[PDB]
Write a protein that binds this ligand. Structure first.
Ligand SMILES: O=C(O)CCC(=O)C(=O)O
Ligand SMILES: [Fe+2]
Length: 199
């Protein structure tokens, strides 16, 4: 299916309520904003970050910055619930030495999407990315190392954690338009946390 990927469905179910309270706390310092891609187009996914470094869009491309380009202040600290859940997920996946210094928080409104891309801004591509899904379900689509590779679909639901390691770490991926619906903890959206080793 996906070489190197360890899928832990509903792993973050118990931590969900606290993770959502902490997303709101992070958002009060560094608000969710729809980032502008280097070409001048606003993304449909709303983003923010927590930790020492944060994923951002810039004029010359994409980069990690210790400063929030909107607030001009540092990104909020990595919440304890975030650190604990990532550590437990990474350890269960065979990565006990994984220490993330960045967590990109994505918010998906109904219809929000993320087109095919590779995560290649990190210094060591051998280091995995821990993905945590919360709220409304979304269809995650992935291919291979090159753009013309056949697409495979995977539904990511509330509490689903995937540790993208090995070959899966380099796969082209995205999110199909979020279907409208209801979730008791997020109301009308989906949140996705992606823990990265960026320094
Ligand atoms: O929403 C997701 O599950 C994927 C997010 C993603 O690929 C990213 O922000 O780089
Ligand atoms: Fe990505």
């Amino acid at each position: 299916l996906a070489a190197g990927a360890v899928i832990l469905r509903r792993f973050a179910f118990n931590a969900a309520e606290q993770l959502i309270r902490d997303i709101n706390d992070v958002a009060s310092q560094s608000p969710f904003r729809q980032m502008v891609t280097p070409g001048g187009y606003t993304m449909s996914v709303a983003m923010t970050n927590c930790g020492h470094l944060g994923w951002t869009t810039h004029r010359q491309g994409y980069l990690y910055s210790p400063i929030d380009p909107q607030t001009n202040k540092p990104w909020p600290a990595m919440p304890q619930s975030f650190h604990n859940l990532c550590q437990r997920a990474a350890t269960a996946a065979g990565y006990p030495d994984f220490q993330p210094d960045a967590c990109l928080i994505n918010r998906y409104a109904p219809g929000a999407k993320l087109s095919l891309h590779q995560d290649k801004d990190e210094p060591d591509l051998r280091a995995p990315i821990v993905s945590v899904s919360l709220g409304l379900p979304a269809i995650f689509q992935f291919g291979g190392l090159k753009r013309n590779d056949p697409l495979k679909r995977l539904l990511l639901e509330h509490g689903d954690v995937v540790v993208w390691g090995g070959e899966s770490r380099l796969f082209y991926h995205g999110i199909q338009p979020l279907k409208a619906g209801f979730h008791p903890l997020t109301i009308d959206c989906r949140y996705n946390l992606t823990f990265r080793q960026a320094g």
